[PDB]
Design an enzyme around this catalytic site. Structure first.
Site, PDB file in Angstrom:
ATOM      1  N   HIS A  42       5.071  10.451  -1.539  1.00 46.52           N
ATOM      2  CA  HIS A  42       5.939  10.347  -2.588  1.00 46.52           C
ATOM      3  C   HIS A  42       6.237  11.025  -4.425  1.00 46.52           C
ATOM      4  CE1 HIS A  42       5.257   6.593  -5.277  1.00 46.52           C
ATOM      5  NE2 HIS A  42       6.362   7.128  -6.074  1.00 46.52           N
ATOM      6  N   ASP A  88       3.778   5.917   2.524  1.00 49.69           N
ATOM      7  CA  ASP A  88       3.678   5.961   0.842  1.00 49.69           C
ATOM      8  C   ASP A  88       1.942   6.442   0.913  1.00 49.69           C
ATOM      9  OD1 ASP A  88       4.140   7.461  -1.138  1.00 49.69           O
ATOM     10  OD2 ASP A  88       4.700   5.783  -2.412  1.00 49.69           O
ATOM     11  N   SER A 185       2.647   5.510 -10.342  1.00 54.07           N
ATOM     12  CA  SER A 185       2.288   5.635  -8.993  1.00 54.07           C
ATOM     13  C   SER A 185       0.992   6.051  -8.480  1.00 54.07           C
ATOM     14  CB  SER A 185       3.926   5.632  -8.188  1.00 54.07           C
ATOM     15  OG  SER A 185       5.139   5.477  -8.334  1.00 54.07           O
ATOM     16  N   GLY A 186       1.098   5.742  -7.323  1.00 51.88           N
ATOM     17  CA  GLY A 186      -0.289   6.562  -6.453  1.00 51.88           C
ATOM     18  C   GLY A 186      -1.532   5.912  -7.501  1.00 51.88           C
TER      19      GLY A 186
END
Ligand SMILES: CC(C)N1CCC(NC(=O)c2cc3ccccc3n2Cc2cc(-c3ccc(Cl)s3)on2)CC1
Ligand SMILES: [Ca+2]
Lengths: 234, 53
Positions: A42, A88, A185-186
């Site tokens: 994402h 994801d 995120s990530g």
């Protein structure tokens, strides 16, 4: 990161930061080797063009140990869906190799079975990043880290307003105000075992940040190990 | 707790039970030591280690 502590010199060396055209960090990543970075799928939609910065601890100052790397190949999981954030996961192949040094080093990829029975049954894991320090706050200029307890899968599902697939797992606190957040995120979710840190997750999402009765949702890395190896082999 | 369930079979890293009995292994960048349990770094900056220098 909400709460937690800031990563001290050499503590979170596998941390990578995806930066947009205007040099702003929007997502995290995990250094897997000199050419590969693990991140969330994402995150690939937050910027039409981005690079990867490593060895960075303070976004507004230079300690000549940082380095920007252009991305040569973006390998996104073909089953990723924005509808549920399932799968994801993404791997980035860099144009030039990362030169390991102080604050720049890869995290270890574990074997599935051992990781699931031994690593994920540990009490806590560690998440880090340059994300928001408060749900409504702004991005952190300091790299932070937080120890997050593994959350029982049942409680995880019972607490979520969104489906928790087999490719995700919960971590964090029920009410304590500590959790990952937007910007992280990530990023890396690693688990320490005898002073060696293993990649166990990817910061994925959450219903807000540090909300009571809610947890942090991470991509379950152990479910994509073969996929990750394939991606790195090619 | 018998094999890998008992203190990770005394392995530094990966532990697997093959035809009963413990068998240890390590992540890329490490080599199994002579005692077949400890993992020794192959070179500088082995994975999973916080940089001390
Ligand atoms: C239906 C599924 C697909 N959906 C995925 C996206 C989710 N939304 C967020 O993600 C998100 C909500 C939200 C609310 C206030 C502030 C920031 C927010 N973020 C962004 C955000 C928050 C975080 C984390 C919080 C704890 C973590 Cl672990 S990651 O990372 N990014 C909502 C549910
Ligand atoms: Ca810096």
């Amino acid at each position: 990161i909400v709460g937690g502590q800031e990563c001290k010199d050499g503590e979170c060396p596998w941390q990578a930061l995806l930066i947009n055209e205007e040099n702003e960090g929007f997502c995290g990543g995990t250094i897997l080797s000199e050419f590969y970075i693990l991140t969330a799928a994402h995150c690939l939609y937050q910027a039409k063009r981005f690079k990867v910065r490593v060895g960075d601890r303070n976004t507004e100052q230079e300690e000549g140990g940082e380095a920007v790397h252009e991305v040569e190949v973006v390998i996104k999981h073909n089953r990723f869906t924005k509808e549920t954030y399932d799968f994801d996961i993404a791997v980035l192949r860099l144009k030039t190799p990362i030169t390991f040094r102080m604050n720049v080093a890869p995290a270890c990829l574990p074997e599935r079975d051992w990781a699931e029975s031994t690593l994920m049954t540990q009490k806590t894991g560690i998440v880090s990043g340059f994300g928001r320090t408060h749900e409504k706050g702004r991005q952190s200029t300091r790299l932070k880290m937080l120890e997050v307890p593994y959350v029982d899968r049942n409680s995880c599902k019972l607490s979520s307003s969104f489906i928790i697939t087999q490719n995700m797992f919960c971590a964090g606190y029920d009410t304590k105000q500590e959790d990952a957040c937007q910007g992280d995120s990530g990023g890396p979710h690693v688990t320490r075992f005898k002073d060696t840190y293993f990649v166990t997750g990817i910061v994925s999402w959450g219903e807000g940040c540090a909300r009571k009765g809610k947890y942090g949702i991470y991509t379950k890395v152990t479910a994509f190990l073969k996929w990750i190896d394939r991606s790195m082999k090619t | 707790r018998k094999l890998c369930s008992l203190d990770n079979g005394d392995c530094d890293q990966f532990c697997h039970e093959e035809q009963n009995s413990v068998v240890c292994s390590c992540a890329r960048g490490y080599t199994l030591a002579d005692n077949g349990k400890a993992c020794i770094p192959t070179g500088p900056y082995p994975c999973g280690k916080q940089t001390l220098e």
